[PDB]
Amino acid sequence: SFESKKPMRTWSHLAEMRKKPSEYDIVSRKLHYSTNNPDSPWELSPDSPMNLWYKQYRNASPLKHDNWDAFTDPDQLVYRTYNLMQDGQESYVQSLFDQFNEREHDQMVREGWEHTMARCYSPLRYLFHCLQMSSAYVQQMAPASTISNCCILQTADSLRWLTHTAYRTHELSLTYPDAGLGEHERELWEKEPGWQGLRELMEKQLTAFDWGEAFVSLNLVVKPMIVESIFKPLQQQAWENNDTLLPLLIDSQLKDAERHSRWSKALVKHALENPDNHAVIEGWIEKWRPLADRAAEAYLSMLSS
Amino acid sequence: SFESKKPMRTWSHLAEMRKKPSEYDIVSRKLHYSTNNPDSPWELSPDSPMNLWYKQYRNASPLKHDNWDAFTDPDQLVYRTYNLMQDGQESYVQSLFDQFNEREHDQMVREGWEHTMARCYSPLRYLFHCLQMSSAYVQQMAPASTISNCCILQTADSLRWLTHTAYRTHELSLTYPDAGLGEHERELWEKEPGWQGLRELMEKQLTAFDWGEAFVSLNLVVKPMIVESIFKPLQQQAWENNDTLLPLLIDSQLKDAERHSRWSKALVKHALENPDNHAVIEGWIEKWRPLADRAAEAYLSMLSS
Amino acid sequence: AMHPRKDWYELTRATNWTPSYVTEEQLFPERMSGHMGIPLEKWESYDEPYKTSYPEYVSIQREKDAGAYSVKAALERAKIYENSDPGWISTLKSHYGAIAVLEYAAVTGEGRMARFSKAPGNRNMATFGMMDELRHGQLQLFFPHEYCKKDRQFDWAWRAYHSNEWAAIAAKHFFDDIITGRDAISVAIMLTFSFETGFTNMQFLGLAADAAEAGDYTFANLISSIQTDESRHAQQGGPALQLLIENGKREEAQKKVDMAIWRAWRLFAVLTGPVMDYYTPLEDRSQSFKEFMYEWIIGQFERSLIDLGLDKPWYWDLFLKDIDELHHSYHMGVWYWRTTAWWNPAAGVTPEERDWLEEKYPGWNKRWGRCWDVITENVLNDRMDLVSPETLPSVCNMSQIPLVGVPGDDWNIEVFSLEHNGRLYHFGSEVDRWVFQQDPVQYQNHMNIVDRFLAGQIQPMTLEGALKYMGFQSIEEMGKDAHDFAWADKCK
Amino acid sequence: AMHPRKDWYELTRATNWTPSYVTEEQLFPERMSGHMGIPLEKWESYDEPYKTSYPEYVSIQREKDAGAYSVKAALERAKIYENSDPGWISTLKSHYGAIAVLEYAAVTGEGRMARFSKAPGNRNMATFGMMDELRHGQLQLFFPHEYCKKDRQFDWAWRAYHSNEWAAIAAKHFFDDIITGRDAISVAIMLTFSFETGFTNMQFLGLAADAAEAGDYTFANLISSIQTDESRHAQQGGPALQLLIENGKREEAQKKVDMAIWRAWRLFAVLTGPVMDYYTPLEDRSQSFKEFMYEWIIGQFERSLIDLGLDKPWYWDLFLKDIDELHHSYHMGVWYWRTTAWWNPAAGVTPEERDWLEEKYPGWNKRWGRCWDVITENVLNDRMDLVSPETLPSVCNMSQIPLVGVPGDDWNIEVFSLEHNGRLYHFGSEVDRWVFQQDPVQYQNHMNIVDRFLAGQIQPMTLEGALKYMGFQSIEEMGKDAHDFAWADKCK
Amino acid sequence: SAFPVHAAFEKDFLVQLVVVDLNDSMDQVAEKVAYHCVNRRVAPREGVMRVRKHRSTELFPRDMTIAESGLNPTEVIDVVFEE
Amino acid sequence: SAFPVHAAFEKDFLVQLVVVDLNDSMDQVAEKVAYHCVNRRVAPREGVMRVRKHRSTELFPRDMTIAESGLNPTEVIDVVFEE
Amino acid sequence: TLADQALHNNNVGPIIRAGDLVEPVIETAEIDNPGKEITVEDRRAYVRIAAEGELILTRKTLEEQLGRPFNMQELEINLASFAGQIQADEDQIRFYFDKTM
Amino acid sequence: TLADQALHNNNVGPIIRAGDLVEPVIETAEIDNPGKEITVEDRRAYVRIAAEGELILTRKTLEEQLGRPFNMQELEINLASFAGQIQADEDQIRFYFDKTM
């Protein structure tokens, strides 16, 4: 029998909130319907290939929680506010490019710095694209839309960094046409020893298909390692070589990185509400840390030589 | 007798354009009705005080042209596009303030630079406010709306610079509380010898009530002098004293200044279509140049000591 | 990190100094500044209550315009021009013509303060005020522009202020008096306080409500957005007034407010009165003109005037009575002389409208109804010669508006005359004559349109000659009945 | 100075490398990537024709949303909900329910490409594609939200995809098949090319035209803005298709397009067909559903398909005939079983509407008109029991939509059946059965709603049991006639 | 002899410019004002039309001319009905 | 003996689920299908209702039962009129 | 005398133009002014919101009721007019009268 | 056969949604494509603009017809769909077919 019920002030799933649903709540929460039916994530044959993939790599993950949808981005970003924020930051970066170019900044760098950039900076486009691809993977596998949304924005941020790197590689090559800038990055990513630790780490991370292990390895191991052992040391080196643009550029990128850290730590906190998860997360961290450390070491020694 | 006539595609005064009227044309052209009746600029008693003022200081100006309304801002700025442009530039400046503050930039300046800032930078708020007041005067007296519009935007730019200066004076005083920052600028503007040339120049310029002489003295003499003898030397001094923020800030301000130069040169060109004007403009320049030069000299020697 | 505005705001207005190379009076001449002898140091206590700063201003004003233009663009195909009642279209025509280029003139009022005000805070807020009015003038030229191709009367959005059309002369006499024709402090008091905190709400918000009821959101959205700027820059008058009162200039301040309110009232009742009670379709009339007056002028503005320490104007009772009567006669005058207007006045006197009029103004039918009965009969009987004038109305030497009274059963009309320097002037009220007497040099040699007609300046000295003088350029431009008299079909 | 995009664009997509620490096939597994054995180096020639870059994207998308939200805000008081024809309101309810959470699912289609596409340019454009679909899902949850307080049926904007309501199962079966349930290259071809360059124009632009005629500019403005993103990210399919053809995979590519177009057609004719030819008030019907089909699908999409080097699908003649017939029967099925829908279907069969139907589909009255005659009679005679079903329609094992035909004078209906692994399946067309045969493991063990009903999964096994299974939560949520049958008053 | 006056007619809503003649009688004045009023905005009625200085109480004798009235050009007059 | 079939009725627009009985005759089948069709979407008419496998040409004998027909559950049948 | 009674009020508060700020401001007025009756007059193009003598709107409450990040200065986008004198800072806006009529 | 004739076209060009770009784009299509007949179908919510085989829109012409500064990338704000393949750069956008039906 069907009762009469009044209109609700918000979605049925939010109607029990005490607080007035925010823009973020209204547009972000509980959107993955593919988690509703354990036997059939997607509305197809229960054993269709993508159904088997999700049952194995999402549903069966050792990282477990009875309410992933309750996760909340501490920054509560939606598409609209992300673009407002990033238009501000990217507009500022583009203005730095413009003004520093007017002042012929690149001609004033210390002798040979173009060679260090060509070796240690421009091939970063491969690394950042790996982070982009990987962020996209976590997005599609994550068991809650509020989690996936952080991953979408993270994927876009990775492309942002990739684009910064592409623009600056080309620009630098205009002042320094004989350093391989824009020409040899692929060879360096494939063959140069300083890049081999990073490339091995990403190739393997990109084949960690469990959503939980993908998340932990990408965001808790790889990305913090890139902050401490790549971004920061590059700023230090730039200072010593009279590159005053790169430190400012990296500071903008570091804002994105710190935001990724914020949602990541927020998810961990939500995940630790289940005691079993502590061991699951530590084990993945322990498993991936060696490769990360080796990646950082190879990179730093290539940088300091 | 009244004929029938068809609707026009634009304002009656623009209907004879060959080119399709732009946004700029539609919203900027031929808006001062106070130039229509030579005997009565304003719809009052012909000899009302403000009518006498305009007849004397606008209509009777020695700077003459039979079609001032034909003047065109080379940048064709309207309110809407000015705000789009300046939100970009000011947003970038505000982001520089924010990031440089994070890096504690001000602690890293060369020993004693705070004293040079306190003496030669912070009192600039008086000078920029003088430019603001003066720009406002030319706005209200100019014989064409397209001229007045350039003056309105110029007035707002002057306030922009004033505000930059106020913000940075306060900020600097937080790191350097014992330099008089935010406390003694008025005394310095009134009593310090290095400011006396500037203050005498502005007090006199602000009492040049003829619209033509106001324009020439402000935009052709004073403002270019501020660019060459104040803005640029400050950047040079900042570089030698490890102030990397000020040069970037001044570069943004210099964009505004160069824009003021652009419309100013455009008006001169329009004015020179009347041969008589060459002598009128030169004579005003010659009349005001001495005071400008003396202002610059006093300032530069205060700066280099 | 950034520092909060409260921590650095003071330095933005720390801009007063002691002149040495010219005198204070030379830098701030009384005729342009209006400081009334109050020394510089005393003005440094002026504290603008609605602050902004440059970075916030450009950021926020960018957002205001983004929305104004977006809504206009999205609604281009709404058929407002084709589907609206003709009286609504006339409301748009009259609004844009009376307002667009006037907004641009208001830039000079704000510029007068930005240069000649002795208050540092005033000079900065007036700089933002200059910008706001630039915005308003540009919006209200841009918005009607697309309609030029549809109707030459929309050309008046640009042309009105360049003409000698009578209503345009009435607007210019008033606004050149309070905006562009007086010293900085008079502007602050007469324009920002007296006009911009009371009367403009009538036209930009009262009218917005009607526009929303009429389903014209491009227009409602525009004018309400414009009024958000006004709410900020109009707050320059209050502090100036308080400062004047604290420095012993209460009397002078009170005189300025008294004069500005009355002049605003007379003019704004010739435009907004007819719009609200006649042009706007009956079902779109949110409130009557009088009701809006009591909300915005008596209820809001008056109370604010009292809170700042001033008194009700001496003419208060005269004003209240006027609100019951003036605009009904102004409407009749504008409609009967419709051919001299650049919009098409709606008569607004169908029976259903007359029932509303009677409710809103008990007695209306035994007064103005008497004239409309005669007019209606002439129309019904196709005697159109009697529905058009063959002479000129007599015109106030202050307001520049026809001299009117109450017609019908309790007929009452009064002209207040004055000899001055061997000339005879006539005024439509005691207050209007008083205004003239407060500052004769402002007004004494001005000639109203009818003085010009009698002095031989309008050739030929005929109704057609006056129309060409008023700047009309084709037969289509001249006002006619909004509905081509179709309204008579409901008076059978 | 800045350097032009053309000068640095290549480096943004110079992101392919040769894997060493895992194999290429491990990095790009065929089940997720769908590269069909084509090596990495061959994919480096993929050239996306509608490019953008990060700085431009955030700048421009900020402007798109500023306008979408501004228009919504300015029109809040337009009375759309109260003043619109109920059939228009149902159009909104059905649109938002069928689309909002599906847009969010499309993010995963784009993510599949962003990670698993071997083309560097594809992976970047899909990153912007991910963002676009996030935008679309968020807009189309935010926009209907305010109506929750007015009508529980708007709760379905969020709830539809979380339910087992039959139409929602039909949408999910189709979209999980082309968006979320296949490898990156199948997505590129089946979603970005096949679905997003043809069919979505029907719902987001064809419908926008109707919405504009209906005076709902908040909605028209929204969906047309959304489609500007689609026009960019949908351009990922073309290059992928050309690359497949150049590497000898024409046959496989053609099979993917053939399958996607048909599946899209069946589903989109159950939603958009009834909206365009029945729910939308007669005077707001810009063009008929068939006319829009010929504009957008035959005229635009087909021609584009041919330009890229593919052939008309083998079923082309079957498709053309279907356009004349399918949706009229889908509409009848949705209306007669209206209680199972989360919107209120309008019958749309008043005489004036039937004249339009006859013009647009000669013969209509001698076919579907026959059923509507019987229905209309029952209503006129207050026999409502005969206007509601007491059993279930038989349902296609592919499309998940009732099995239908042409009723009336030249009755023709056909079911296409299939035994497979000891099970009997039924399909509504030859093509639908063919689709199943192209990839049985995708479909073989799926049970349609009626299979579930017969297998005891729906308890109680009654029409009320099925309604609760379908996720309805109150009496108000279930569909009824949009006008409460008021339309019968015009059939006298 | 062209003589401009401003005239308010009984029961009308405004004052208008009416150009009369220096040698017109008050009866002829009343007539010229009435032309622009009666049957336009004012209903016709029985009675005698009289002329008086604006809001004055003393009426002008019906046969008196403009020249004999002492009225100056551009002064205001009322046209009212004998009571 | 509950026996589900999918049935298309002559001149209707769809196929529906009708649950008949294993021991129903073709005449009783026709009746149960007709319940969900005639007077709902299909106009009543004179004549004899016959049952046949979907789009088959051979009709089922009127007295034959479901069990004797060889029909399996969930198969499709048409209900048409003798011609 | 309708005018005296119209004049003898102490109503203060924002006039909010039609748009997304109307309901959040009404709600905010109610929350941030406990023990004050909030009156609302709806004119479609704008809403007149008032209390007696004083009306506060805090940024924090307004952000909460609006449902998105909000800076006090932004209210100007939608504040079409107001009754009372105004006192505004980064944390709130206060509408108030000095006198009591 | 209405469908064959519908299929056998070579129409290319932008579909511009309702807004400030409609008329400027129509005008621009006419100017930048001399000797091509430009066809316009008005559906109120959008306008379908086409020519045979190829249709160019240059940034320079569009800026001129729009009356305000304009960057080619911005067309995306109003380009709701398009017929033909697309080739876009900082200077113009070209709609075109490879084949001739």
Ligand SMILES: [Fe+3]
């Ligand atoms: Fe204004």
Ligand SMILES: [Fe+3]
């Ligand atoms: Fe203003």
Ligand SMILES: [Fe+3]
């Ligand atoms: Fe989408």
Ligand SMILES: [Fe+3]
């Ligand atoms: Fe899409």
